XYZ file of C-alpha atoms in Angstrom:
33
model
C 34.030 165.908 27.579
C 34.324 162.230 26.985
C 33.252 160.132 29.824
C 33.189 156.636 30.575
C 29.037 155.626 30.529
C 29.741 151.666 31.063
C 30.949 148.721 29.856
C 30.255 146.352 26.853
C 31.507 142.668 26.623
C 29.645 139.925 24.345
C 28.875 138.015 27.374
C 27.072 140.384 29.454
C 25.634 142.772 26.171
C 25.732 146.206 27.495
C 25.895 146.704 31.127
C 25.500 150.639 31.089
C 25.758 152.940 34.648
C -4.123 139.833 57.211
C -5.334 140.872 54.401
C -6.786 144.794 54.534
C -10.139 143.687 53.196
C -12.035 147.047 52.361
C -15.608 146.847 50.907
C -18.907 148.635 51.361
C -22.168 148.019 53.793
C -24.481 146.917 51.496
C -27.230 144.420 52.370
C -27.134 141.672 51.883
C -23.915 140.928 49.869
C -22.281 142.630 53.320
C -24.718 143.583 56.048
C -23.989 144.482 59.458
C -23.891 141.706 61.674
């Protein structure tokens, strides 16, 4: 039936109800040391 669903008031408008670093080995941008 008719139920409450929240409120209205003209203040408020309508209030309703280390970094993991993961790359790839790939010379020679990242090679294995």
């Amino acid at each position: 039936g008719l139920e409450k669903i929240g409120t209205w008031d003209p203040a408020s408008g309508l209030n309703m109800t280390s970094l993991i670093v993961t790359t790839i080995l790939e010379e020679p941008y990242v090679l294995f040391k």
